[PDB]
Amino acid sequence: ATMQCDVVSVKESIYSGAVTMLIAKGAGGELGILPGHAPLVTLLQPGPIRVLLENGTEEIVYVSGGVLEVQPHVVTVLADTAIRADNLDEAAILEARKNAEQLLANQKSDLDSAAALAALAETAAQLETIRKIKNRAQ
Amino acid sequence: ANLKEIRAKVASIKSTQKITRAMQMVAASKMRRAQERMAQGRPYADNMRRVIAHLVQANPEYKHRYMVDRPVKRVGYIIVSSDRGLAGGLNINLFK
Amino acid sequence: LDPLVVGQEHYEIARAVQNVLQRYKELKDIIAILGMDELAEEDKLVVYRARKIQRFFSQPFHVAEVFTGAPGKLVPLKETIRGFKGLLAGEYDHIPEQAFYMVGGIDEVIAKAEKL
């Protein structure tokens, strides 16, 4: 059969589903994983991971650091940093979202100060000359 | 008197009001996005505490420097604040 | 009101307190729009100083007892100037504002604050 595999990072998960084969680079031994396997834990090399479904296809995820826990029915990786990817060449892709969120971080200021600080600055600016001439009879 | 300037001041204030309304709506969207963002971090810590507990219950023979407590001489403190203000007095009461 | 008449010290203190009140008066509008916390710390000091000054100006009078009942105060100028120098020295920036209201001298302010 197959068994649940959960590719989770601190920010979020990456992949989930029930699978029957896995390839992983442990701190020590390289490991192949199959459902029902004896429970095990170990540290993982910062390399790519291959996981094989029963549909004749095998996924790839590129991981940098992290730990692997396995149970005979659930397996997961706590990813230091992982990306659904074939190779570190896909680093050209993670920076895309990185700079996207960077641009958003620029945008939040580019609006916040520009909108709030400015308009609110002109608001109370010249009001005094009005409040002083309220009861003017001439 | 210069009444037209007064009317202009009124119009500027109206515009500022609409801009504040936009501020509020954008803040609401950001609130919902971040509120979503919180929940995604659960399973990591959940499973990881689970396995750490499994470890310590499997190995109570020793402890970790982060598991131990000796008398305190000095402390370190970590505070998180915005890059820009205007968001209530969260920094204020935090500092207090 | 020149230092050549009231004495240099008196003129200096008067100028200083006047400038503080002036500053606060300009500042007063912004807090109507923004929170007072959005101001610099010195600004908050200024606000509190001026407000307590205002409180201190309230002087009971021996005619006003008909309205309320309390006796008046004939404060000698020396006590006034000493109290204001100490206030603008900030020696009392830990005192509730109400300790300054409708009181006599600075000593009475301290007595009130302790009675608080």
Secondary structure of chain B in the HEC alphabet?
CCHHHHHHHHHHHHHHHHHHHHHHHHHHHHHHHHHHHHHHCHHHHHHHHHHHHHHHHHCCCCCCCCCCCCCCCCCCCCCCCCCCCCCCCHHHHHHC
Q: Which of A41, A51, A47 lies closest to A15 in space, CA to CA?
A: A51
Question: Among all chains, which residue has been given the structure tokens 């580019």?
Answer: A110
Residues near A50 by Cβ (< 8 Å), separated by ≥ 6? Answer: A22, A23, A58, A59, A60
CA distances from A126 to B11, B60, B86 (A): 14, 71, 22
User: Which residues of chain A lie closer than 8 angstroms to C32, CB-CB?
Assistant: 124
- By CB atoms closer than 10 A (0-12, 13-18, 19+), residue A90 is middle
CA distances from B46 to A65, A74, B51 (A): 19, 14, 9
Residue of C nearest to B13 (CA): C33
Do the beta carbons of residue A68 and residue B48 sit within 8 Å? no
Q: Which of A7, A14, A6 lies closest to A94 in space, CA to CA?
A: A14
* Other CB atoms within 10 Å distance of the CB of residue A49: 25
Neighbours of A, requiring at least 3 CB pairs below 8 Å, are B, C
| Pairwise CA distance, residues C108 & C71, whole Å | 13
**DSSP single-letter state for residue C24:** H
Which chain C residues have any C-beta within 8 angstroms of a chain A C-beta?
26, 29-30, 32-34
Instruction: Determine the distance from the C-alpha atom of residue A37 to the mean position of all C-alpha atoms in its chain, rounded to a whole number.
Output: 29
Q: Which of A38, A8, A32, A7 lies closest to A20 in space, CA to CA?
A: A32
- Helices and strands, counts by H and E, chain C: 5, 0
How many CB pairs below 8 A link B and C? 6
User: Which residues of chain C lie closer than 8 angstroms to B88, CB-CB?
Assistant: 35
A103-112 long-range contacts, CB within 8 A, separation 24+:
A108/B84, A109/B83, A109/B84, A111/B26, A112/B84, A112/B86
Instruction: Determine the distance from the C-alpha atom of residue B46 to the mean position of all C-alpha atoms in its chain, rounded to a whole number.
Output: 21
Residue of B nearest to C38 (CA): B86
* Other CB atoms within 10 Å distance of the CB of residue B17: 12
Q: If residue C9 lies in a helix (H) or strand (E), which one and from where to where?
A: helix C8-33
Secondary structure of chain A in the HEC alphabet?
CCEEEEEEECCCEEEEEEECEEEEEECCCEEEECCCCCCEEEEECCCEEEEECCCCCEEEEEEEEEEEEECCCEEEEEEEEEECCCCHHHHHHHHHHHHHHHHHHHHHHHHHHHHHHHHHHHHCCCCHHHHCCCCCCC
Do the beta carbons of residue C10 and residue C85 sit within 8 Å? no
Taking the Cβ of residue C38 and every Cβ of chain B, the question of whether any pair is shorter than 8 Å is answered with: yes
Do the beta carbons of residue A1 and residue A35 sit within 8 Å? yes
Residues near C12 by Cβ (< 8 Å), separated by ≥ 6? Answer: C3
Q: Which of B75, B93, B83, C43 lies closest to A107 in space, CA to CA?
A: B83
| Pairwise CA distance, residues A37 & A22, whole Å | 11
| Pairwise CA distance, residues A39 & B41, whole Å | 24
Neighbours of C, requiring at least 3 CB pairs below 8 Å, are A, B
Residue range of the domain that includes C116: 1-116
**DSSP single-letter state for residue C100:** G
- Amino acid identity of residue B44, one-letter, is Y
Q: Which of C47, C13, C8 lies closest to C30 in space, CA to CA?
A: C47
Residues near A98 by Cβ (< 8 Å), separated by ≥ 6? Answer: none
Angle, helices C41-57 vs C8-33, to 10°: value is: 110
Query: Which alpha helices (DSSP H) does C34-105 contain, by range?
Result: 41-57, 77-88
Q: Which of A120, A137, A133 lies closest to B5 in space, CA to CA?
A: A133
Q: Which of B52, B56, B47, B42 lies closest to A77 in space, CA to CA?
A: B47
Give the closest-approach CA distance of C46 to chain B in angstroms.
18
* Other CB atoms within 10 Å distance of the CB of residue A44: 22
**For this experimental structure, what is the resolution in angstroms?**
4.3
Domains in chain C: how many in total?
1
